[PDB]
């Protein structure tokens, strides 16, 4: 289990508990004042800054360096870009697809309709030959 959703939950809950803490102190800041005829924020503030910094940290680890695998192979051969996001220039965006043996044009190149009907017949015959293989 990685830290991002953990940090979301603990950050929301530590803010929630800072909330209940600030509830008690600041409700009893003006309610107790009524006892004094309308008469420790500091560590509350420090734990608050802890909560804010941790929630900010929490958002980052929901963003990971993008990591990929090759389509044709069946080994892992894990493809890392060392990059967090996906870029805008079509030339190198086309690169990150071409690291895979894929073509987002897809069907126009492959023509599934004509190929398949012969493909299924010959491939069953063909592997039936390869069953010894």
């Amino acid at each position: 289990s990685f830290v991002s959703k953990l940090l979301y939950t603990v950050s929301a809950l530590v803010l929630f508990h800072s909330g209940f803490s600030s509830y008690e102190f600041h409700h009893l800041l003006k309610l107790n004042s009524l006892n004094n005829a309308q008469g420790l924020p500091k560590d509350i503030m420090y734990e608050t800054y802890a909560g804010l910094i941790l929630f900010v940290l929490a958002v980052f680890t929901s963003f990971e360096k993008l990591q990929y695998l090759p389509i044709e192979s069946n080994d892992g051969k894990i493809i890392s870009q060392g990059n967090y996001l996906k870029e805008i220039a079509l030339n190198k965006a086309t690169n990150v697809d071409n690291l895979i043996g894929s073509n987002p044009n897809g069907e126009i190149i492959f023509t599934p309709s004509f190929v398949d009907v012969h493909m299924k017949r010959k491939i069953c015959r063909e592997w039936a030959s390869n069953t010894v293989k």
Binding site: N35, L40, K42, D43, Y46, E47
Partner: protein, 33 residues
Amino acid sequence: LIPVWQRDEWLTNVVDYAVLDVFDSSLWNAYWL
């Protein structure tokens, strides 16, 4: 005999008044406590 009812008439004329109210009743260590 039976005390049937009770009355109090000390309160028949008040001149002046006053009000009384009623009411209820370093950092690292702070974190844990």
